[PDB]
């Protein structure tokens, strides 16, 4: 509990509504049960975007290379920017809804226009931690009103000449470029962002799952030409990964069948859920086997979902799970 780390790092408590709910082993397709074909249908790539193309351009390349019909990315990265670019595929394409508003982390290089003592650089940068005022750019919105945004943390890494390398964690909508420009004004001499790379976007970060377009295509070829599935399979994360940072509600089988058949999530359909859910919050609706069923907006707080006997706990906005997994109404 503190604006000092990325919210995705904060663990939530699991409240239990119904302790005896059980799940049928015959129903559903947990990640470790999905054939490669199906894994792709409900997959998300943790792509290391290269500097150069626009993110849209990158998605287009991927749609072509993998012969896909649908794909989408979870957080626009400017052309010169590299880094984590989650790319959801086919039936999972809309899970980006859960990523676009997630917290982000970057490693940025600021170029000062004058000589300033290190201590003053560190001092002034520590001032930009927390809720700050940052008006949107000239490109976004038709109402350039100044709003606030959270900078979860700013950590200066190295200082060479007038070049300042630093790591920064922020809530969606925070422009690193503006942040650095403002720091320049605060220091008087001025500054601009010379380089930028994203190291975290929601639950996606720089780990073994981060893969480049070169690796992607090659692993693809290994699967298509040599019949090797292991590499391409690992290059694709199951959609469930794209929802790891979201508060969840685990529902009974009958509730899963109801939701995958157009109904909303009923309060009595909840077996257990995360605490801290507030009305209006985006929540991941999960199966008792941890499969993603849908994304929705919370109609009540965790405490209400926990104690209530009836009504709608969550308004379903998008269903990912096919109707044949968990059959009947």
């Amino acid at each position: 509990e503190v604006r000092r780390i990325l919210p995705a790092d904060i663990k939530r408590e699991v409240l239990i509504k119904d302790e005896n709910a059980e799940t049928n082993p015959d129903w559903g397709f947990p990640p470790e049960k999905r054939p490669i074909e199906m894994h792709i249908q409900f997959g998300v790539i943790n792509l290391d975007k290269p500097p150069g193309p626009t993110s849209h351009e990158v998605v287009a390349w991927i749609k072509k290379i993998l012969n896909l019909e649908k794909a989408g990315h979870g957080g626009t990265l400017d052309p010169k920017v590299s880094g984590v670019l989650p790319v959801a595929l086919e039936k999972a394409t809309r899970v980006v809804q859960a990523l676009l508003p997630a917290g982000k982390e970057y490693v940025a290089l600021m170029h000062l226009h004058g000589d300033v003592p290190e201590d003053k650089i560190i001092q002034v940068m520590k001032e930009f931690e927390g809720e700050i005022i940052q008006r949107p750019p000239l490109r976004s919105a038709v109402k350039r009103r100044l709003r606030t945004r959270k900078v979860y943390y700013i950590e200066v890494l190295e200082i060479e000449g007038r070049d300042v390398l630093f790591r920064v964690g922020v809530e969606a909508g925070t422009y690193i470029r503006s942040l650095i420009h403002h720091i320049g004004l605060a220091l008087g001499v001025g500054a601009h962002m010379s380089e930028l790379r994203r190291t975290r976007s929601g639950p996606f970060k720089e780990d073994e799952t981060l893969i480049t377009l070169h690796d992607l295509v090659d692993y693809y070829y290994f699967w298509k030409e040599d019949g090797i599935e292991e590499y391409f399979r690992k290059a694709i994360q199951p959609m469930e990964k794209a929802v790891e940072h979201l508060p969840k509600v685990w529902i009974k089988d009958s509730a899963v069948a109801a939701v995958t058949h157009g109904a909303d999530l009923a309060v009595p359909g909840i077996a257990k859920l995360h605490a801290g859910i507030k009305r209006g919050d985006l929540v991941a609706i999960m199966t008792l086997k941890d499969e993603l069923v849908a994304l929705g907006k919370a109609m009540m707080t965790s405490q209400e979902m926990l104690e209530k006997t009836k009504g709608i706990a969550v308004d379903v906005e998008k269903v990912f799970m096919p109707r044949d997994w968990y059959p009947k109404l």
Binding site: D48, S82, H214, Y221, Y231
Partner: peptide
């Protein structure tokens, strides 16, 4: 830290995979 530039034409993709198949 940035990954190498990419072009859909991917020249040398065949060469790259040749050695990559080996290592793997």
């Amino acid at each position: 830290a940035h990954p190498p530039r990419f072009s859909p034409e991917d020249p040398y993709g065949e060469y790259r995979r040749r050695w990559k198949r080996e290592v793997l």
